[PDB]
Each structure stands twice: as C-alpha cells, then as structure tokens.
Design a protein around this ligand. Structure first.
Ligand SMILES: Nc1nc2c(ncn2[C@@H]2O[C@H](COP(=O)(O)OP(=O)(O)OP(=O)(O)O)[C@@H](O)[C@H]2O)c(=O)[nH]1
Ligand SMILES: Nc1nc2c(ncn2[C@@H]2O[C@H](COP(=O)(O)OP(=O)(O)O)[C@@H](O)[C@H]2O)c(=O)[nH]1
Ligand SMILES: [Mg+2]
Lengths: 36, 218, 436, 440, 53, 181
C-alpha cells in the first residue's frame, strides 16, 4: 500500500535514474501493477 | 529493415542493417611470384635431397660467393608460395643464405622490404608465421643490421599490429602445440622484442608509432 | 592572440582561398577596400586571428599566395576582394608546373620554396603566439600538389609544435579533368599523411551531386563549389573568432577526432543547405539540422558513410540554440544507428556551439566526420594508378625530369599501409576474440 | 571573522561563477558596479558580505574570487559584461594557448607557466582575511584545463596552506551524455588528485539537471544558464549559515566531520527541494513535510544514480526560511520508518539538520519562483559507487587499444599514470563495497 | 572594446600607436582615432590633402 | 576456508603442476588470455596471464565472491617471472581491530602512500626468476598500528608468469627449504 506520496514515487516505480534517459513526467511513476 | 542515416532508422523497431564488413582479417587472393617463374626456368643452383633426418636443401655451389643483391630478394619474394615443393625452397634458402654468409646482408637490406611486405600482406597464418620466424633470424644473423631496418619499420609493423591478440584462452589446460610455434601473438611480440633488442635507441619510438599497445624493456 | 597564417597554392587553391577571404571578410564586415564598416558588435574582436592592421586604418589578410604560373595571380588580384592582400606576399614562378609533380617538387619548386619560406617566416613572426597554418590546394594538379606538400614538409620542420591545416581537393572517381591525376594523388598522399595534423578531403563529384540534388541549382559554376567549401572551412575557426557557450578551437578537435596519429582525413559538410524555393517553406530546428547533417547525400567527399563505421564525429553549431536539444539529438542518432559507430569508443560525437550565426541564416552547423568510408577513395586511387604504372604509361615526363622507379612504387606501399589500418579499425570490436 | 575564497577554473567554472556572483550580489544590496545605493537600502549589516566580499574605504565591494582560464574566450565577456566593474582586474587571469582537452597539457605544459601568478593572487587574497576555512573551487571533470590545472592548483595549495579545506564542486560527466570524446581519461586523471586532496568533493551531472528542468520546471529545451542558476542556488545554500543567523547554524568544518565517515568516502550528492516554476509555486503550500520528501525522490537527484541500490551514510539537510525545528523533527521522523530508504547499521543517528531564517533569493530574468521554504540535501550514499563502475567501463573500452593516449604521452606524462589512477578507482570501488556490508 | 577593463585580450583598433598612458586612456585615444578615421573616410568633409596629418 | 587445515611451516595455495591449478581460483579475462606454458628457463610448466589492461584480467584466491580464506601463516612467497611489463598483486589482511585492510604493490608506482583501507607501495623486480618475500605481520606493524591474524585473499594480475604461490612462517633461507619449493 501507500500511506504517503513518497512511497508511491519510491518503491513501486520501475524508473532507474542511472539508466533511463530523458523521460517525461509519466514514465517515472509507472508501476508493476500497470503491466500485470 | 533499414539502410542507415535516414528516416528509415527513425522508426519504432527499425532494424538497421550494418556495415559491409570491410576487408580486414580475411585472406587476400594470391598472385604468381617471380620465384616459381625463375625456378621452373632452372637458373637456381639448388637441388633437393631427402636425408633420413629430414629434408635438406643441397647447394651445388660455394654459398659464400653469390650475388646476394640478385638472389636474396628473389628468395624473399618466394615466401608467398603455399604449394609444398616451393615454400621449402624459399624458407630454407633464406635461412641458409642468411646463416651461411656475413657482411653482405647490409647492402641488400633496402631491397628486401617490398617482398617482406608482400609476404606479410597475404593474410594467411602459416606464411605470416614463416616470415616472422625468418625476420627474427634476419635481425640477429649479422651485425650493423637491426638499426639499419629502423627507417623501414613503417612498412613491416603495420600488419604486425593486426595479430597481437591471437593466443589460446585455455585457462588451465596447457596449449599442447607449443613446439610448432603456430600461434601468432607470441611470435609477433618476440619479433617486436628482437626489433627493440637490436636497433638501437631510436627503435622504441618507431615501434610505438606503429604498434601503439607496445611495452618496452631496458 | 591565437593567429593562423594562411597559404593557398595552385589554380584550384587560389580560387578556393579567394572565395574563403570573400566569405570571412563579410563575416567581419570588411569592405573590399580593406576597411571595416560592418554592423555587428563582435566583428572587430578577434580580427587579429586572421588579419593585420596597417597604418591609416586598413585590414590586410595573413595570406601568402604561391604559384608557378604568373597568369593566375592577376586573376586573383582582379577579383572582387583581391585588392586587400599585400603585394609582397605574392610569390610566383615564371615557368609553369606542367601538371608535373616533378616540376612542382624537385626542379622548379626548389628555387621558389626559399622565397615563400622567407615570406611565411616574416608573416609568422610578427605574432605574439601562433596556433598553426592553413593551406588550400588540390591533389590532382602540378603546383597544387608538388609545391604545397613540399611547403608543408619544409614548414613542419621549423614549427613542429604547431598545428597544420590542409584542405585538399582529391580527384573524383568518375569525374576526370586531367589525364595524369592518379600519379599526382599517389605521390602527394603518402607525404600528406606524415606532415600535417588535420586534412579535409573534398571531391568535386560530391559537390556537384549536392548542387544538383540538394541545392536544386540549374547551372552551378565553379564559384558555387568554392562557396560550399568556404562555408565549412570557416566553420572550424568560428570558435576562435566568436564567443560561444561551448568553445572548441583547432587543437581541441585535433585531439578529439584523431585516435591514432595517422587517421586525420576528414569529411566536411554543411547542415542548413536548402534550395531556392524550399528555403522559405522550411522550419529550422536542431532535429531538422541533424538529418541533413548525417545523411550520405550531404557528404562533401564521394565516400558513402554507410560503407563503414564512424570513428569520431564533430559537429560545430552556430546560432543561439539550446544544449539539451543538440545533446538528445546526438544521443538518439548514436543510440539507434548503433552498428555504424565504433563500439570500443563509448561516445563518438563532439558538440560545439557558437552564438554568431552565418548572415541570413538563423541557425547553422558544420560537420567533421572521421569514418572508415574513406578507405575506398584511397583504394580507388590505387586502382586508377596501378593500371597506368603497370605499363609505364606517362613516366617519361617524370623519370626524364629525374626520379627512380622505386619512388612510385613506395607511394603505393604507403597508400596500402594507410588502407589496411582503416580496415583494421573498422573491423576491431571491444573484445579481441570475435574476428577469428 | 568568516570568509571564503572562490577559484573558478575552466570555462564551465567561470560560467558557473557568473551566475553564482550575480546571485550573491542580488543576495545583498550590491549594484553590479560594486556599490550599495544611497537612494534606498536593504536591511543588511557588516557581518553579511564579509564571507564573499571585501570592503574598500570609498564604498566599493570586491569579490573574493579568482577567474582563471587558459583561454580568453570566456573571460573577456566578464571584462566587457555587466559585472565588469565588480572584479578587481588582476583576479581575471587569462592565458594564451588552449588545454585542448588534455590533462597532460594543463598539468605539465601550459599550466606550469601560469600557476605562479594564480597562486600569488590566491596568497594575496588570503592575507586580507582574518579567519580561515574557505577555498571553494569550481571545475568540470571532462575538460582539459578544469581537470589538469585544477589538479595542480590543489596540489600546490595542499602544501602551501596545509590543512584548510579544499571545497570542490565538480560537474561530473553524465552516463549516456558527453560533449567530448576523451572525457573518461580526463575524469580518471582528475579523480586521482581530487580523491586525495579535496576534503569533500561535490558531484553534479548535467543530464540530471536537464531532466529536472524538463519535469519539475516545465521548460523545454533548456540551456546551460538554467543549469548554472540551480548550481548557484545549491552553493548559496551551503554558505547560508555563514552569512545569515539561523536556529541551527552549521560552520564549514561542522558538517565535514558529520558527512564524511572515512578519508576517501567524501563524494556527496545534492538535492534542492522546491524547484518549481512561477505558474506552479503559488498554487500549493510548500510545507516542510513535503519538501522534505521532495529531497528523497529517486528522480530529483542531480547525479544519475538511484539511492535504492545503496545504503545511506549521512545526510546534511540545510533548511532555510519559514522553518521551525519541530517541523523538521517530524519530517525526519517520517522518513526513518520507511523501509525503502535504507541506512547502514553503523550510523543509528543518520541525519544532520540545520535551520536558517533567510529565504532563497530570486534572479530577475530567471526560472525559479520565490518560495518561503527551501531545502538543500547533501546525501552521502553507497549509490555513487555505480557511477564509477561506468567510468571504469568507459576507460577500459578505450585504453585497451591505447586510443588517444599518444596525445597525452606527448606532453610530459608517462604511460603508467593511467594505470596508476585506474587502480586507485578500483580500490575506491572496493572500499565502497566493503563499507556497505552489514555487521553479523 | 570601448568598455574593456585593464588586462584585456581583445583587439583594440589603432592601439599600437598610443604612446605613454595607461590602458584606459590608451583605449579612449585608440577608439577616438578609429572613429575619426572612419568618419573622415566615408563622409566627405575635408578637401584634397586635408584628411590626414 | 582453510580453517581446519594444520597450517605447518608452509602452505602451497597455487602450483603449475597438477590437473586443475586454478580450481579454487576465479578467472576473469577481458582483452587478455590465460594459458599453461612450458618455460624455456626453468624447464617446467608455468602459468601465463597477460593482457593490455593489467586490471581487467586477474585471478582471485577464493572462487566465491563473498567467501574468504583464513591463513595463519605470516609470510608470502611468489615465484614470478619478470617480463619487464606492468604487474600488480594485492592482499587482504585481518587484524585485532577486526577490520579488513588491503595492501597493493604495482610495478608502475613510485610512492608509498598510506590510507585507511589501501597502502600502495611500489615493487621492483630483478631480471629473470625471483621470489618476492613478503612479510604481512611487519607490514601491518610498521605502516599501520595493529597486528596480523588472518589474510583473506590474494589477487594476481596480468603480465606475469606464476608458479607456486605459497605462505610460510619463517624465511627459509636456501638450505632448510625443501627442493620442491
Ligand atoms: N553542467 C554544466 N556543464 C558545463 C557547462 N559549461 C561547460 N560544461 C561542461 O564542460 C564539459 C566540456 O569541458 P570543459 O570543462 O568545458 O573544457 P575546458 O575546461 O574549458 O577545457 P578545453 O576543452 O580545453 O577548453 C562538458 O562535458 C560540459 O558538461 C555548464 O554551464 N554547465
Ligand atoms: N573547387 C574548385 N576546383 C577547381 C577549380 N578549378 C579547378 N579545379 C580543380 O582542380 C583540379 C586541377 O588542379 P590544378 O589547378 O591544376 O592544381 P595546380 O597544378 O597545383 O595548380 C581539377 O581537377 C579541377 O577539378 C575551382 O574553381 N574550384
Ligand atoms: Mg575551454
């Protein structure tokens, strides 16, 4: 679950800041539950 | 599929092809040489006798007195022959006339660079091994010679830079085929080693100008 | 205080240089009289890079004009901007080069190399510090090839820690203009590979193809090709003459674009080239510039870049543009055209930006590309040379002037040595086990 | 009795310092001629400008800055710009020949004949200063002069001043982005000296600031100036406790013993929390409870590394503005229970928070908006270890065929100076792996 | 080049004839001679044999 | 490992004679190669690792990345052939402070620098065959303030020929040493 906005950005997001390049506002906070 | 720097490759799974894979590391087609042409003629004073302890080339002439300026470049241009009764004659003639015979190699040295490049430029491994072995014998067979080759390092070493990365990767298993020195990486590193040992103090910067991965001793 | 001494040799080099001076004089607002009445603020700033100021308020170029025929210097003098040069730097012989490398190099270059060396000594000593030299010529003619490279060899021996810039017009594959040009090109390249630090190869055929397909020109004269050459030969010195958000002079590009000390042959280009009607209906952005920069049609040399892997790419931009846009454009171009770039070099693109755009253009870019595509031009020259040399076609105009037969077969040897290393660095991968 | 000396080397350092000094002039009442107006005045005292400026008798303020580059092409716009009367003309040091992206050139060949002048000017600036503890240098890790001349400058200053603290502000090269070809060589060579002579070396990538200006700020196609302004705000945040009185003031030596556990692990990250545009700042109350969470976001770091593949060591969080200690107390207590933000078992405290009372200033013609509360986070984490394995990969990709090496052998440097520094970076990676293990 | 302070690497026109002053008055005199030269060159006020010393 | 071994006067941990010399040894190869070669100097097998980058190709003493060996014996002997190239090695040492400390010697170093985890001293070799006599106890006593209890790994890098890497207790001079060492 998410009892904060920080955990929504933090845990379930699949974004790798070291790898992902030039992503927009929506491709950071994409979750695993969206895919499956 | 795609082609290159176009809107074809601007797509979403545009698979781009690749380059045409240029002519490096591939054996170039051979050409007839002057050695076979002069040998079928029969002007060479050599004859093959099969001794029990191996094949030995028999000379019907005093090997000390011979026009090296006419014979040594002719034998060196015969290294490009892969057919079996000619490669022995070229190799053994070079070895015998380099070992039996001194203080005549030096004026011939500016004439034998083009056959050496011709032998090395054929990208076959056996001929490269043989010309590296005879170059190692050549740079040590006489005096005053190794630092006479040092202006011509720009015409030998360019293809020596190709095959310095050819060794066996068997980490624990011993390479059994060590007596027949057929792997070319160590042979190239020993040839460059002999070019540094004999060749004076100007050889290192020339080898570095040709082979950039080189490590110097002394 | 970083100043460059300019030289031009031969009938092609003189026209190329004259168009070059016409271009950069209007860049800095210099009238044909030699006087400054431009409009921009930054024009008179770094004019000491290329010019000298005389008493009375004139601006003379730092140009030394060398010829072997006297009838080609007054054509340059009687041009639009031919009256700005000093008359003392006009060195010229009396007997023509005869399209002979022999007469350009050995027995009619030897008596005029002294005078031009004293003139270039006088020009390259009034400076406080010196960065390098420029020479514009062609590898097909007699005094464009035999004299200019001898001059390069005799200048390199005196200034060994300064850069050298050669902008050569190599003979075209299917466009033939002289009979004897393979001999001149083969004699010239083997010592243009050991005496200068940056060389640009421009083919007349590729320039014609650009003028036909890109520019949509009906009748392109020889002025338009020289304008094309000057549009990219002056884009590599705009970091010296104008401030930018990320500057890169000649030596910066010499370090970045040259991985190994011989592969310094480059392919120029210009980004915002557009037709006469398509100019007005055009949107000019950095992703718009990159497609015309990187395509094979805009290459000024007749070597297809799709035929080999890029070693290092330079892209000097002119105009007030963003940096993330150029950044992401080069990143995309490298990322999904991944098989056309060297994989043992991580990033192959150098980016430079300048704030002063060319006049009439709101955004421009110039391309310097070191590719293994250039290996086919040298092989083409060797193939066009070996047919003549096999039967000793025209050697009596050279050997009768005095040479040895080995002096022609060593040029081919150095040509093949140049080809093999480009082949090797094209096929070399990051690991050293996959080619065998 | 507090001051700082700023040495901006390289084109990147000088262009950063332009925005930095315009910011510092706007932070006080100083006009760009260097004089305070008499028509109007701000509420300032003599203890504010002592850190960065010096006072003459007539009323002219002079920065404690040295602008040195081997090029002219970045310094004459300082001499001919709007901030041309602010600087003493001898501080603006201009060379003749270029570094040509060579560590070798700027370390051996061209920097050796200019270092005796910049060191003398640094000496002359450090004798007008009563206190000590300054030396805030700015350079990039990719160029030639900013990696070569800065290394020699730190080498000389370490034996000339002994202890001090060489504060170092790097622009480290981005993972997938570089504007040069020989950047890994320069970065490894300058890391070999920054790793042993800088006391805590700050890290910033250009690509992550591009992303932050892309998403947090709503601007499209940003330029270098937008990056430099945010970097200047970060630097002004550090020295905010040296010029304005707050609840928990932090000296420059105070947070060096708090952030840096071991003599080599001194490469902290940065995070600036309320970086939002003018059309967005007025529609939300940027309270402490959410700007604290904006510091720990994976996408708000200006170094391209997720903190999620590492364990935090210490954080120095410097609030400013309308901030109360119980607010940051509750904000830190909120983070400490989240099981994603992992901490090492040998640092049970884990935090260091300072509170200031002076809000950040705006630059007319800038991009940020006036916020009441701003947070600057200084995270020391194991996550930066993955940013140097890629530098190792980029160095071994090119060094393995000795590409571009002969341009560096040509100016003074012997061949094994590359292996000598690569072994030091490998030792650094192993140290980061060793320090991050749990205790059984 | 008018608003250039002291040590300055730009090309100030007509500067290598200014004789015995500092940088600032040298720049002032140099740009004044430059402007005088341009204005006398284009606008035809002076008669023949009167536009140069 | 090596906790239940007797740990007598010496402990061989590598040898070029046998079936699998690099059994417990990891083998990373990148732009390099590893092979066994009959030497023309000692007329016996040697190991042979080299490459352009000395750091990419190496061998580590325990195979598993997290497993560590425990050797009580203080000394370290390495019969390494000098090829006049770039050769490094590196050990890891446990102390009474119960921390892990690393000593690295490289052919291209000229200064002795002391750090809390690393200590990079130089090392010089002779012409042909020689044994590098290392003293871990004295190098922990002199450069650092602590003592020596265990060594945790050794790591041999490129451009060298390895034969019989072993630890010992006392420096066996020439005669009390057995002929097989
Ligand atoms: N983040 C940021 N980086 C900059 C800026 N200006 C230049 N750079 C960086 O500078 C790097 C290029 O090297 P520089 O430091 O500019 O070169 P230099 O120190 O002047 O040395 P030379 O190349 O010889 O002129 C690029 O990778 C940029 O990331 C800037 O304003 N902001
Ligand atoms: N770009 C350009 N090329 C030219 C021009 N005139 C001649 N050429 C080329 O120059 C080559 C001949 O070189 P040449 O002038 O004889 O060199 P030189 O003998 O040293 O003077 C021909 O192949 C032409 O294609 C010109 O005006 N512009
Ligand atoms: Mg610079």
């Amino acid at each position: 679950e998410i009892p904060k906005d920080d955990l929504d950005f933090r845990l379930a997001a699949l974004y790798n800041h070291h790898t992902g390049t030039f992503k927009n506002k929506s491709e950071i906070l994409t979750h695993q539950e969206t895919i499956q | 599929v795609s082609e290159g720097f176009t809107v074809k490759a601007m797509m979403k799974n545009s698979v781009v092809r690749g380059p045409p894979s240029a002519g490096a590391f591939k054996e170039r087609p051979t050409k007839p040489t002057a050695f076979r042409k002069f040998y079928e003629r029969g002007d060479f004073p050599i004859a093959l006798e099969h001794d029990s302890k191996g094949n030995k080339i028999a000379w019907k002439v005093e090997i000390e007195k011979l026009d090296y300026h006419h014979y040594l470049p002719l034998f060196f241009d015969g290294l490009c022959e892969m057919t079996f009764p000619y490669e022995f004659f070229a190799r053994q003639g070079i070895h015998d006339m380099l070992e039996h015979g001194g203080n005549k190699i030096l004026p011939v040295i500016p004439q034998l660079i083009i056959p050496i490049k011709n032998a090395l430029n054929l990208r076959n491994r056996q001929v490269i091994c043989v010309t590296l072995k005879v170059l190692q014998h050549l740079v040590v067979s006489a005096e005053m010679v190794g630092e006479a080759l040092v202006p011509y390092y720009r015409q030998i070493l360019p293809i020596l830079n190709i095959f310095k990365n050819k060794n066996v990767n068997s980490g624990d298993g011993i390479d059994y085929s060590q007596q027949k020195r057929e792997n070319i990486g160590d042979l190239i590193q020993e040839t460059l080693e002999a070019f540094e040992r004999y060749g004076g103090e100007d050889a290192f910067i020339n080898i570095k100008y040709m082979v950039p991965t080189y490590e110097s001793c002394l | 205080m970083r100043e460059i001494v300019h030289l031009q040799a031969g009938q092609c080099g003189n026209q190329i240089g004259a168009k070059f001076w016409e271009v950069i004089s209007d860049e800095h607002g210099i009238d044909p009289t030699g006087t400054y009445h431009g409009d921009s603020d930054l024009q008179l700033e770094r004019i000491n890079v290329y010019y000298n100021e005389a008493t009375g308020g004139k601006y003379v170029p730092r140009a030394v004009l060398v010829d072997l025929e006297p009838g080609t210097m007054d054509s340059v003098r009687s041009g639009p901007f031919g009256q700005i040069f000093r008359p003392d730097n006009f060195v010229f012989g009396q007997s023509g080069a005869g399209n002979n490398w022999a007469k350009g190099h050995y027995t009619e270059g030897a008596e005029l190399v002294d005078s031009v060396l004293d003139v270039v000594r006088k020009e390259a000593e009034s400076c406080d510090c010196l960065q390098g030299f420029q020479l514009t010529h062609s590898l097909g003619g007699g005094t464009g090839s035999g004299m200019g490279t001898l001059l390069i060899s005799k200048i390199r021996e005196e200034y060994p820690d300064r850069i050298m810039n050669t902008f050569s017009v190599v003979p075209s594959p299917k466009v033939s203009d002289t009979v004897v040009e393979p001999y001149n090109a083969t004699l010239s390249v083997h010592q243009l590979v050991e005496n200068t630090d940056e060389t640009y190869c421009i083919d007349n055929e590729a320039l014609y193809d650009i003028c036909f397909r890109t520019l949509k020109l009906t009748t392109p004269t020889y002025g338009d090709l020289n304008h094309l050459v000057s549009a990219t030969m002056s884009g590599v010195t705009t970091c010296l003459r104008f401030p930018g958000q990320l500057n890169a002079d000649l030596r910066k590009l010499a370090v970045n674009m040259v991985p190994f000390p011989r592969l310094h042959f480059f392919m120029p280009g210009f980004a915002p080239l557009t037709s006469r009607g398509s100019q007005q209906y055009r949107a000019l952005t950095v992703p718009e510039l990159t497609q015309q920069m990187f395509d094979a049609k805009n290459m000024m040399a007749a070597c297809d870049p799709r035929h080999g892997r890029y070693l290092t790419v330079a892209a000097v931009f002119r105009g007030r543009m963003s940096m993330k846009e150029v950044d992401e454009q080069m990143l995309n171009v490298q990322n999904k055209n991944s098989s056309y770039f060297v994989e043992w070099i991580p990033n192959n693109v150098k980016t430079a930006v300048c704030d002063i755009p060319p006049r009439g253009l709101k955004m421009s870019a110039t391309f310097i590309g070191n590719s293994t595509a250039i290996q086919e031009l040298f092989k083409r020259i060797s193939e066009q040379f070996t047919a003549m040399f096999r039967r000793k076609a025209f050697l009596h105009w050279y050997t009768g002037e005095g040479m040895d037969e080995m002096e022609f077969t060593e040029a081919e040897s150095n040509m093949n040595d140049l080809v093999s290393e480009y082949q090797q660095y094209q096929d070399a991968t990051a690991e050293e086990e996959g080619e065998f | 009795m507090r001051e700082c000396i700023s040495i901006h080397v390289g084109q990147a350092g000088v262009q950063i310092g332009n925005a930095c000094w315009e910011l510092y002039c706007l932070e006080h009442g100083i006009q760009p001629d260097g004089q305070m107006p008499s028509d109007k005045t701000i509420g300032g005292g003599d203890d504010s400008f002592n850190t960065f400026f010096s006072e003459t008798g007539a009323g002219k303020h002079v920065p404690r800055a040295v602008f040195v580059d081997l090029e002219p092409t970045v310094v004459d716009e300082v001499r001919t710009g709007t901030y041309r009367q602010l600087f003493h003309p001898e501080q603006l040091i201009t060379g003749k020949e270029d570094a040509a992206n060579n560590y070798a050139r700027g370390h051996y060949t061209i920097g050796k004949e200019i270092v005796d002048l910049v060191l003398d000017r640094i000496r002359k600036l450090a004798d007008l200063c009563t206190g000590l503890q300054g030396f805030l240098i700015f350079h990039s890790f990719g160029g030639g002069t900013g990696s070569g001349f800065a290394s020699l400058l730190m080498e000389r200053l370490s034996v000339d001043y002994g202890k001090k603290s060489k504060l170092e502000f790097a622009i480290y090269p981005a993972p997938q982005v570089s504007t040069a070809v020989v950047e890994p060589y320069n970065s490894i060579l300058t890391t070999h000296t920054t790793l042993e002579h800088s006391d805590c070396a700050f890290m910033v990538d250009n690509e992550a600031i591009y992303d932050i200006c892309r998403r947090n700020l709503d601007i499209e196609r940003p330029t270098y100036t937008n990056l430099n302004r945010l970097i200047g705000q970060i630097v002004s945040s550090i020295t905010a406790s040296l010029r304005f009185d707050g609840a928990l003031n932090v000296d420059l030596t105070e947070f060096q013993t708090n952030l840096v556990p071991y003599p080599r692990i001194h490469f902290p990250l940065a995070t600036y929390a309320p970086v939002i545009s003018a059309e967005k700042a007025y529609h939300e109350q940027l309270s402490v409870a959410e700007i604290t969470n904006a510091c720990f976001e994976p996408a708000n770091q200006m170094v391209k590394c997720d903190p999620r593949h590492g364990k935090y060591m210490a954080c120095c969080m410097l609030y400013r503005g309308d901030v109360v200690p119980k607010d940051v107390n509750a904000a830190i207590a909120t983070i400490k229970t989240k099981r994603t933000i992992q901490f090492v078992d040998w640092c049970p405290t884990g935090f260091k928070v300072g509170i200031n009372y002076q809000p950040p200033t705006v630059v007319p013609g800038g991009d940020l908006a006036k916020v009441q509360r701003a947070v600057c986070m200084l995270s020391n984490t194991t996550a930066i270890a993955e940013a140097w394995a890629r530098l190792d990969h980029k160095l071994d990709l090119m060094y393995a065929k000795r590409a571009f090496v002969h341009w560096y052998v040509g100016e003074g440097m012997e061949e094994g100076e590359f292996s000598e520094a690569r072994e030091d970076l490998a030792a650094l990676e192993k140290d980061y792996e060793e320090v991050g293990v749990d205790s059984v | 080049q008018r608003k250039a302070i002291s040590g300055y690497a730009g090309f100030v026109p007509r500067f290598a004839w200014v004789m015995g002053m500092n940088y600032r008055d040298g720049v002032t005199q140099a740009m004044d001679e430059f402007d005088k030269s341009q204005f006398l060159l284009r606008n035809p006020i002076c008669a023949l044999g009167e536009r140069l010393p | 490992m090596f906790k239940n071994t007797f740990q007598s006067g010496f402990l061989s941990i590598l040898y070029s004679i046998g079936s699998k010399p690099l059994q417990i040894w990891d083998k990373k190869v990148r732009n390099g190669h590893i092979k066994r070669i009959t030497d023309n100097d000692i007329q016996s097998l040697v190991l042979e690792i080299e490459g352009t980058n000395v750091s990419t190709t190496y061998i580590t003493c325990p195979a598993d990345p997290k497993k560590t060996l425990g050797i009580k014996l203080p000394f370290l002997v390495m019969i390494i052939k000098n090829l006049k190239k770039y050769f490094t090695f590196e050990v890891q040492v446990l102390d009474d402070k119960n921390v892990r400390r690393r000593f690295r010697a490289s052919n291209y170093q000229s200064t002795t620098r002391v750090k809390p985890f690393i200590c990079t001293m130089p090392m010089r070799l002779d012409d042909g065959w020689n044994q590098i006599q290392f003293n871990l106890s004295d190098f922990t006593r002199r450069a650092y303030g602590t003592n020596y209890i265990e060594t945790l790994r050794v790591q041999i890098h490129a451009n060298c020929r390895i034969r019989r890497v072993y630890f010992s207790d006392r420096l066996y001079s020439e005669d009390e040493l057995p002929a097989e060492f």
